[PDB]
Amino acid sequence: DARQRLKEVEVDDNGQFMTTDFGGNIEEQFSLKAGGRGSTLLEDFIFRQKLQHFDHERIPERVVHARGAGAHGIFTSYGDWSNITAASFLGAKDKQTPVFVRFSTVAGSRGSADTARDVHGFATRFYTDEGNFDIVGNNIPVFFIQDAIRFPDLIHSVKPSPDNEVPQAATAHDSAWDFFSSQPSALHTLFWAMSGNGIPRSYRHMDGFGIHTFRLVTEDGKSKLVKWHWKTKQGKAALVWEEAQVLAGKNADFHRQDLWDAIESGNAPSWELAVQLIDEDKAQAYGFDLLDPTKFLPEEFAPLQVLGEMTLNRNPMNYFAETEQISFQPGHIVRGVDFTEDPLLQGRLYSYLDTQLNRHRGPNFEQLPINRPVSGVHNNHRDGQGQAWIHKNIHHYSPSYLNKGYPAQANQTVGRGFFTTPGRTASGVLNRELSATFDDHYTQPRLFFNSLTPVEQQFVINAIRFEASHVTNEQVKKNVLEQLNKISNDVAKRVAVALGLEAPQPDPTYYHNNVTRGVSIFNESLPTIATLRVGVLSTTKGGSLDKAKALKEQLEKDGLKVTVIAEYLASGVDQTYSAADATAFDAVVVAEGAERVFSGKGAMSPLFPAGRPSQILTDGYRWGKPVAAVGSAKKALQSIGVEEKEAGVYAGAQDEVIKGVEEGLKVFKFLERFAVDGDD
Amino acid sequence: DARQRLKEVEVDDNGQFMTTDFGGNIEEQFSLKAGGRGSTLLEDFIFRQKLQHFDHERIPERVVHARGAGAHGIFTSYGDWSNITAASFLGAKDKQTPVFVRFSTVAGSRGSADTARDVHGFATRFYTDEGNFDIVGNNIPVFFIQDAIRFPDLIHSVKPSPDNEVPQAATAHDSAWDFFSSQPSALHTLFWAMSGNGIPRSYRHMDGFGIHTFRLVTEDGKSKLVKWHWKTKQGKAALVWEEAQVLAGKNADFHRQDLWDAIESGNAPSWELAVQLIDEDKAQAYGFDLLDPTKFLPEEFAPLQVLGEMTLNRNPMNYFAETEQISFQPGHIVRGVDFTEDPLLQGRLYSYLDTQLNRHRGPNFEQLPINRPVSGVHNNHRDGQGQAWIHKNIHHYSPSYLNKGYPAQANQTVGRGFFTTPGRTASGVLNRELSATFDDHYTQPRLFFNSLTPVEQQFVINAIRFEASHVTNEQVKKNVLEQLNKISNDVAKRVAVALGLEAPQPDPTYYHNNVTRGVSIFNESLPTIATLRVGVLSTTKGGSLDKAKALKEQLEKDGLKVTVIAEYLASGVDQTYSAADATAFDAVVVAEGAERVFSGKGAMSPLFPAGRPSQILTDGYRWGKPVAAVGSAKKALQSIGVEEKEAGVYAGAQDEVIKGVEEGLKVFKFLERFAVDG
Amino acid sequence: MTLNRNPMNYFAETEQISFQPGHIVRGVDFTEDPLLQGRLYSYLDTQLNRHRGPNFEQLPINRPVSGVHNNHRDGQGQAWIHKNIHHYSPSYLNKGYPAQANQTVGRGFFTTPGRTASGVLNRELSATFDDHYTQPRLFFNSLTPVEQQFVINAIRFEASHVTNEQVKKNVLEQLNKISNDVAKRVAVALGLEAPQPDPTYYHNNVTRGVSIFNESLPTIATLRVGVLSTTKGGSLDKAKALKEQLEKDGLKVTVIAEYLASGVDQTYSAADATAFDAVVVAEGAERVFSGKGAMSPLFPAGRPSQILTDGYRWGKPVAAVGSAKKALQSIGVEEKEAGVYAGAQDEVIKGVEEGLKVFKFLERFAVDGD
Ligand code: HEM
Ligand code: HEM
């Protein structure tokens, strides 16, 4: 059990009498009053201790990445990697290390929707036996900006307008696009956010990236540059925008529920941890500067090398104590790893330590059960709000004769202490500048765009068209086109159409035709369909339900999560039509006989909103899902104008349909259902 | 200007150089580094002071009502009400008092959707010349529970499950319905939240209530029991659930944007302050106890008496400093008003003062500009985190020879001091009980349900059906049905259908057929259609767009907010089909010629999702909106199987369409489009 | 109650502990004491400031040993992980746990059943509270004469710091309501007129148990004794034997000399009479009370004499062994006085230990009108 160390602070209230927080059994359902219909007494200590705790329940949300969810798991090393790093957790084959991972969006506050369009966080803690090591990453490999000092500008610009706090969890407003166009380094991440990476299917279907180049360091102090990669074993998958929007309303908790359910059902997600490794002397050898976080390193120059695998298999017991309270830091480093002079990474080291003081209102947040290392803390730190320990050493200072030198200094040769990479040097003038090597903001967005499928390219363009059409300032929209046009003239043209602005002239300085692998989502079939959801549309009239039941049992044997939907919760029914929506499912199947609710008296029930069964099948089809109808239910497909042999449409007997749907699920989204510029 | 007093704290940065927080001009776009590609230096004081401020921007959200928005305005008394209260803001005809109001949901965290189904907050501050007086109310006249000590129980149960923090801003889960059925007092508020009150059209289309019985007290110390009401001058309006859900995703900010826009467009919303006034001897006279906050007093026993009018006419300049930081308290009371022994209200007095300590991290939150009274603060309080004043009186205690008795004691007779109603007495044993007069949890929910239109009743039934079907535990569902059955056997039966269960046999103990006025939403037409939104579906091809401009110009001259929609932002187009959704509008009109986007090639642009124009018209129709098509655009109505002859459906020329749409907007929702059981 | 363990970390234990009068258990209840009533609110509330959060009862020093089971969750610094996901009551889903306790089940707390409220809601105090003078007089009546003089001299000292003349007059007017004699005696120091008696509250009643100086100590265990010695001659060997005997008798002894020679616990420079309950000069150490020995760069001028002087003037047992009597003579202190002891080591030890029980010798303090 990854949560094993947390067991000692777990509190079971079953079979117990109610108490105050200072002990003593009580009742707490009535206020103490002065007479029968009397005023409440101040001496009601029970009322006040209960309400005080309630009144003070909330802590500040995270300043960014406020919306998220997490789970515990185990990381397993595939080998002894002491040849490239002294890091203990990678020091042997099959070595296991507990982890906790929190996934998130970026902009929205605590209660905003999981399926907002946004960059997503992917933060991992390794509780190693040489300290906590955090890889605080995202599902996109490049960041908007090049210097940490600009983070409040970025964040202010994408978060709600400060006059009315509108809009929630969205970059679709003036200030965000004023920023993206005024600070062109942002264009690369913006393109990734406008792609499927901005609206993934689940946390489990995301890759993860450390983004920054870090350093791996060996015992003898030799270093290599490194990019961290998390490669999802469930495969990458994304929604379409018009679907994500409905889903934001129908189930704001779509992603946190997906993760929870996968883990509860014994389908723990896994990712492989992989690295790109680069010689120190090649930091500027690949067409950009590896200290620049707005660029990624094409796998064709440096392939991924797999170090191990992480599996998330335990949900938290209390979301607040565990998920909400956990405090990640890139400053959480261990011997064997070092920083680089990435000016974005540099400032992060300051900010995440500092922000905990606000979020936890004190300096002792590392003493919280979810933050505690498993390797033990020995130092001369004392006092601090909420100090949870009692220190025995009264000589809390170094150096000292009285404490015999304990606790003792550890370094490269003694005590396996941390050490900064021995070869690192500083050269030149103290400066408030950025290297001119950081200056190309267009080549990689163009590279990224070239590397997507034609329909994926269209999704990016349509995302931009949708977003920029919300910008009220005409000049900002012009500034946006001008920047887009430096990346690609065709992209600018296609976006300009939506905005009713003139197709601008080519600005070819940065244009190129290069491609790189592995940045696309939709052109690779999923390697597994386990956990994927099938909504089975049935009816309580006739024999449809019994057929629905058999269909479900078969699909379940194949690892799918099936929801049988009907007018009311009859035996075998998982969900009513009133409660149902296509957004909940990866495939939609009409069970035989259920064609009766797509037309006629059966479609006219007080039990669900008018048109609901048809809308479900329609949404499913239009959003590119595998859709199907068993036997006579093919009538339902006709009723919404869908033809039986379209791509990703299956009509026939149960066996056929099952086969077809499972095939369709691997493709996941059928892209031929989406118009591409130049079809009309 | 209601915000006038805030002007001295406004900071204008136009035409200025960037500075640190301690002054000194700076640049702050580059970290200071050791060498061209070097590490950032600790001595970069500029980086640290900027990022520290950013790192610390967030404060805890409200423990309840976290999601909300507000505005400034003016309350005007219609009279000298000294014959019923000593309260200064009510002491003269035409007397004006600045206000700030915040509207909210209850359960959702800060970025949750406006159109979640929930009770709504309606909190009003009067910055009177005798202190801040807050009426911290809801858009529903009764509350779930009868003793404040149960508040954490109610709120824990409705908010997300504590293991996974699901579901956001919804009562549609096991724990909530477990509590509602385990604590039957909750049933009355539940029925209201399951009606249109749970999914209102806007903050501007809500009534408000203080819920509790309070006391109005005259200078001589005589008291009357009082209920506070806010009556909207815009009329009440509500959405339908299937619409509210989509709107939650299409625009989480629907209500805050609605309020903001109405104020900027010069359409400041108004409410009348009205009271029910009854003698102390009526406390238990009307079949329930007026100290019981789970009951309301039917207007048939005590009519509304209008005291004045509040108009919200200024938006904030900074949402955080004003809306987020404002700290309401029912304990903010003034001379002329007093509490009652309502056990719910009693505990609130403690909770709102205490909780500010968490939210504002200190004791001086009343010094914040949005919280400061206009009337002067003079006492011996000193120090505390963030102390913003410098006190001149060094003899900070009373009594005292050395300060010559200042600041001085004020009471009923000197200095217009606050005073507790002189006749209030306590009698009997100290007890941890509630009166048996509180015991009937079923008669008034039945009264409420009886007083709705048949389709409104169906909406309540269908909300319960939707919600209760999310409950995984079978026994909890059975518990819910048993409790509903005590209110109405018919309700229980109709809900039980969705759940696939048998309702218990009728239990006539609390059944009755009585009705009461003013609790329905859909039964009365709106008094104005100003600000209501019309989505006009057009197209960039041919002559549609020019005709849409003409339609828009006419509609706007009659007070409407019109959005011209087309495939791309052509001249005269307000929004693209890609960006459009029916949830944003109160009426949908197809401009002549736009029928080309409902079928054929016009419907298949890569500029918008497949079927989008048809979906907007379809949603608009099924959600009960006025829908219409000018001229040949009737083909669009035909394409979705909607007939010209239907109520709330309009075709023909621009003149017939405009007149029909405007009349339909008064009806607001066409309830004949919704099926009723049987 | 016996206190037998010091804390290991002062901050974590002593600084962090949070007392409340609202920390009450079954079998105790409050009364309508208006001072007590408000404290209940204040001590809970103030912890929010001092500890910056609602979870201070979770701090090790604040935790009860008896188990905490309720539906409270979250809050700053939440140190536990709650298993029960149905964190509300009443509830079907949690099976009724944690369960209500009361007078009849689960040994719950209960308010005294017979307590009643009766009358009008008021912002008043009962007229039964109005006599502010009788008990102060009772208290003053029940102290020894010198003990009474200490009270008067404390008031004389303090009120003489008051700059405002009317405040000083107001004080005398209040003192005079308790005792005309007390008012007159205080008035002397303030240079104000002895006011006219107001007999309304005067009385001669006494009560037992409020005096400190009227009773000898039950034990002299732990009481410190500072032994003034010197590194010259045989004084230190004698100081050592004196120390060994006194510590056998349970006292804590500090041998003091010019420097930290073998046997010396403290130097004269570091020493002061305030540290000790008795002061005895070791034989031979009279050499540091005058002449060459009294004049050393190792300690401030007059230090050994000042220690003996302070010791005597502050009413402590003081003594000198043998020739050290000269030290007593050098400060005008005579062997015949109470709490002054001279002679052989045996006589001095017995005397000092008997004197430590009296603790303060009040003959050395002048009383008004003596
Ligand atoms: C490569 C660039 C970045 C990545 C991959 C990244 C990723 C993340 C992630 C995943 C989280 C959420 C951790 C969680 O789940 O609790 C987070 C939070 C945060 N980030 Fe970053 N971020 C980046 C840039 C920055 C920069 C430049 C700054 C400021 C210098 C910054 C400041 C913060 C702060 C203050 C938090 C809140 C931490 C807390 O409250 O515990 N981030 N970031
Ligand atoms: C008739 C019953 C109630 C009504 C009408 C009501 C209404 C409201 C409203 C409108 C707000 C939001 C104020 C704002 O916009 O900032 C609020 C917040 C709050 N309520 Fe109540 N509520 C009721 C019951 C209770 C009870 C019984 C308690 C506790 C005993 C309570 C404790 C709180 C707290 C602690 C807040 C947050 C205040 C802040 O952070 O500034 N409420 N309530």
Side-chain angles (χ1 to χ4, degrees), chain C residues 41-58:
Chain C
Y41 165 82
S42 181
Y43 292 68
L44 182 62
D45 170 54
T46 197
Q47 309 306 329
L48 296 167
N49 187 44
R50 192 151 76 76
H51 287 293
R52 221 123 290 285
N55 284 313
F56 51 87
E57 304 284 37
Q58 298 188 335

Side-chain angles (χ1 to χ4, degrees), chain B residues 516-628:
Chain B
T516 189
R517 67 168 178 257
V519 301
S520 176
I521 285 169
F522 296 92
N523 117 279
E524 211 197 352
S525 292
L526 300 183
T528 179
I529 66 183
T531 80
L532 300 197
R533 297 202 200 260
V534 179
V536 175
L537 313 185
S538 200
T539 176
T540 60
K541 324 282 197 202
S544 188
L545 234 34
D546 286 330
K547 300 171 184 182
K549 282 176 91 277
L551 175 56
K552 167 170 193 176
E553 276 171 39
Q554 280 308 309
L555 292 167
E556 288 181 317
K557 91 177 213 176
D558 285 272
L560 297 166
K561 216 298 168 177
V562 186
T563 299
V564 173
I565 303 163
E567 305 93 333
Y568 67 80
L569 292 180
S571 127
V573 178
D574 303 299
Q575 184 175 67
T576 72
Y577 278 112
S578 178
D581 190 88
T583 48
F585 310 113
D586 300 305
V588 180
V589 178
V590 192
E592 178 156 56
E595 61 264 26
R596 63 167 309 277
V597 303
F598 284 75
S599 68
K601 49 233 175 181
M604 259 173 305
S605 178
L607 288 165
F608 59 75
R612 176 60 56 80
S614 299
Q615 193 68 60
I616 293 163
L617 192 62
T618 297
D619 288 337
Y621 173 83
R622 311 229 251 224
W623 295 340
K625 301 179 186 293
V627 301

